[PDB]
Design a protein around this ligand. Structure first.
Ligand code: FE
Ligand code: FE
Ligand code: FE
Ligand code: FE
Ligand code: HG
Ligand code: HG
Ligand code: HG
Ligand code: HG
Ligand code: HG
Ligand code: HG
Ligand code: HG
Ligand code: HG
Ligand code: HG
Lengths: 340, 340
């Protein structure tokens, strides 16, 4: 029941962000929420060409790196590459079919597009510091540790997409598909979308930042200069992306958009909380692997765990959630030099 | 079912363009078909920002225009805006769930992204030539003369999308849904895809170009020059987009990518031929509504119909279809000044 061009002349200013009439005309002279138009404008002004960044010095740096540091660096890079691969396609496949206002539709496509630029950035880096990129890329798919930390991301998107297909094909109600009873509840689908957004928020605001810290730790040593330049550019984008998800979530929570979503945000609160607690634990567990062959001065399991708790509290507070971790000061204030 | 990250390590160089294993890792150091990587590179280098183009004098030119000429210019602009609205979202929603090689996946997202920039460009133009852009945007959805091609175009996409969901949800076979038998055939799905693709190729290769002539005719008279500058940039992008669909179609019919597709394409060639002629006829019929109150310097019903036939012959031959019109040289050579 999805359509690429709904023929009903509708007031796009009055549609809810999600689940309303599919967006027909793409206009940018007005919007229900100007924050999304502002985000589009900003992201477009941040467009960069990865391959333009000189990374020839990085090959020398990397090869000369102690084996355990090469492991730390490359393992971190492979994870970032994984996340970007997922983020380049997922926002589009999972959200586009459900958006009902033009500024949000285009913001999602712009956001997703910038993620593919980040992916291209990592190919540029990988291809220039390693001898055979295929070993790195292939390991991304395998490697239980990397998939372990990322566990739950693709699965959630997949479940939302599947439920969305059922909704578009069958509509609300209880159906019989190949002799099985299938229930399609719009309310449940909204919950799925809401929790998917919370998870994306955790991904954009926590998982990417924990990785940036590992990357910049080398930059602090005056190593991997090119990578550092690229990561700074990528981080600039992720800041816009999480600004976007925080706004989506807080606008839904406010009751100014779909009233049912405000009810859901309230009922889902514990699940929201749990999602962050789980994500944080995954980032922490990754330390055992990352530092399996040894750690670095200023970068080890304890420091990583403290940073994960530090940032998780900040991100959770931003979307109105209680803080699970004890409050603490930034364990790595040197990271600010590289961020925003 | 569809997944945002297939956990199976696969050789992406050996997957078919479509219907293979969903793309997991986004890598750009290698590709099965380098044409797609080259197109991504070219499209990225062509990025531009509409807002930077001076269109302040277009408002005055538009007002001074004879009423029938205002009609021609604005009707054309509205149709271009409609097409970009569809093209900004559709390639992503319709093709992403079916692509199995990374270079094509990212090319589609880059292609779609550039179309959203074109949409933003049209907003920029509209806002600078009329009082209250709302009048213009609303007419796009309801304008009868325009909402004929939209229906036909959106129909191909919508049907492909629906069949794709059934395929991902139920797989091949004879199924039952609420008392009705539902047959899902991969062969039919491949045919449906071959159909959006041919239709999108005609959209990119013929529909857009006919509107460009409509638009550059003013530029030749030194009118609506801001619009012209923007259309020149848009046309530069469409050339890349049609190159991409031409390669996709030719790789599918040759049989080098997927034997079954070559088989299917050969079977439905008469259909594709009629599909193309119908698109050409729709563009011709539009000339009527366009010049219902009079023609202008260098552009009339006859010249336009000649151009449509000229362009259609070229595009159809490019994808292996018989020529439907009598051969002739470019009826409007002057357009070459504005086209890639
Ligand atoms: Fe990113
Ligand atoms: Fe992001
Ligand atoms: Fe376009
Ligand atoms: Fe195009
Ligand atoms: Hg999600
Ligand atoms: Hg770290
Ligand atoms: Hg909930
Ligand atoms: Hg919540
Ligand atoms: Hg800790
Ligand atoms: Hg199509
Ligand atoms: Hg024309
Ligand atoms: Hg065909
Ligand atoms: Hg065709």
């Amino acid at each position: 029941a999805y359509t690429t061009f709904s023929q009903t002349k509708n007031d796009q200013l009055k549609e809810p962000m999600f689940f309303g009439q599919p967006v027909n005309v793409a206009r940018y002279d007005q919007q229900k929420y100007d924050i999304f138009e502002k985000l589009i404008e900003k992201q477009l002004s941040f467009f960069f060409r990865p391959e333009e960044v000189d990374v020839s010095r990085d090959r020398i740096d990397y090869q000369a790196l102690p084996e355990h540091e090469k492991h730390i660096f490359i393992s971190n890079l492979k994870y970032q590459t994984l996340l970007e691969s997922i983020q380049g396609r997922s926002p589009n496949v999972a959200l586009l079919p459900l958006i009902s206002i033009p500024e949000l539709e285009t913001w999602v496509e712009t956001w997703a597009f910038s993620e593919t630029i980040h992916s291209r950035s990592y190919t540029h880096i990988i291809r220039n510091i390693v001898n055979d990129p295929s070993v790195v890329f292939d390991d991304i798919v395998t490697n239980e540790q990397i998939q372990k930390r990322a566990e739950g991301i693709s699965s959630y998107y997949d479940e939302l997409i599947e439920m969305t297909s059922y909704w578009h094909l069958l509509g609300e109600g209880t159906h019989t598909v190949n002799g099985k009873t299938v229930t399609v509840s719009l309310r449940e689908l909204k919950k799925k979308l809401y929790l998917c957004l919370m998870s994306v928020n955790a991904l954009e605001a926590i998982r990417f930042y924990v990785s940036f810290a590992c990357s910049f730790a080398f930059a602090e040593r005056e190593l991997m200069e090119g990578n550092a330049k690229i990561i700074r550019l990528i981080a600039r984008d992720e800041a816009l992306h999480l600004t976007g998800t925080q706004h989506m979530l807080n606008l839904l929570r406010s009751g100014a958009d779909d009233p049912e979503m405000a009810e859901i945000a309230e009922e889902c609160k514990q699940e929201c909380y749990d999602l962050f607690v789980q994500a944080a634990q995954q980032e922490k567990d990754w330390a055992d692997y990352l530092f399996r062959d040894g750690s670095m001065i200023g970068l080890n399991k304890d420091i990583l765990c403290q940073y994960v708790e530090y940032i998780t509290n900040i991100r959770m507070q931003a979307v109105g959630l209680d803080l699970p971790f004890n409050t603490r000061s930034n364990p790595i204030p040197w990271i600010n030099t590289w961020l925003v």
